[PDB]
Design a protein around this ligand. Sequence first.
Ligand SMILES: O=[N+]([O-])c1cc(N[C@H]2CCN(Cc3ccc(C(F)(F)F)cc3)C2)ccc1CO
Ligand SMILES: Nc1ncnc2c1ncn2[C@@H]1O[C@H](COP(=O)(O)O)[C@@H](OP(=O)(O)O)[C@H]1O
Length: 258
Amino acid sequence: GAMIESSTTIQVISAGLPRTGTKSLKNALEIIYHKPCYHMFEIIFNKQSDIIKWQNLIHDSHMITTPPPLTTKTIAIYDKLKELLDGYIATTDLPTCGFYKDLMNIYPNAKVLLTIRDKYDWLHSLRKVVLPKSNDPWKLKIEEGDKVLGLNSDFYKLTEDSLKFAFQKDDLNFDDDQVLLECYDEYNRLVQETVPSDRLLVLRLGDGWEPLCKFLNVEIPNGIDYPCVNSHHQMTQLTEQLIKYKSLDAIIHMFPDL
Ligand SMILES: O=[N+]([O-])c1cc(N[C@H]2CCN(Cc3ccc(C(F)(F)F)cc3)C2)ccc1CO
Ligand SMILES: Nc1ncnc2c1ncn2[C@@H]1O[C@H](COP(=O)(O)O)[C@@H](OP(=O)(O)O)[C@H]1O
């Protein structure tokens, strides 16, 4: 296909929850658009200063009225969200995914994705990487590796509060598997009820390039396989290597996705 000059603005909003292929999708969208895609890893590696800003936004988010019409309070919140996303061509992952409705309003020419997978595979992945149960010994290892990266209690608070926001819960028993499974199913159902079908592509792990590229009117990247990264097995190795070497820079050459 011909090469065309793409605008550096949000063109793709992925509502998919963490551990549904968001990092592979981030990589895929950066391969297509050659500009950055938001993801929690963007906060960890490039924008830790953004943590307080997302926390502030979530704290105020209850004041949004879904437009149209646009209220004064909503405009003020939307401006802060636009600022956070300046320079990016897409959003994935926490903390953005719960804002998909608001991002659709801010970026009316953006298209919407939803990544989904088997609910029990999702929970298992979530418990291995993001939210281990309180009494799980692996939680202490995760926390020890995270400190190497400069991640503290505010990072965990952002994960919790952005998951609460996505699930529209005032509080959440994070150790309750049944609650998380029910929230997962309700969240994915509500996305599909909310986004006009013409504007939504539902992706399942394994779908690869073709449905995505068709939806985005781009050629399939030539000779590049669809990304397959961020497995919980690989995250466990990362945590263990951070613990062992006590720096990211000492080991990053061993993790080509970082
Ligand atoms: O899915 N994730 O990765 C995810 C992990 C968390 N929370 C914390 C809890 C445990 N800690 C493990 C870990 C260490 C280093 C990296 C690195 F690769 F970014 F360096 C990634 C994960 C991260 C929160 C949200 C997401 C959504 O993306
Ligand atoms: N192309 C692909 N095909 C199959 N699974 C994929 C994939 N890309 C990512 N995944 C899976 O998606 C999950 C990561 O999601 P995220 O990037 O949102 O955190 C991992 O699940 P597992 O933890 O079950 O391995 C990973 O293995």
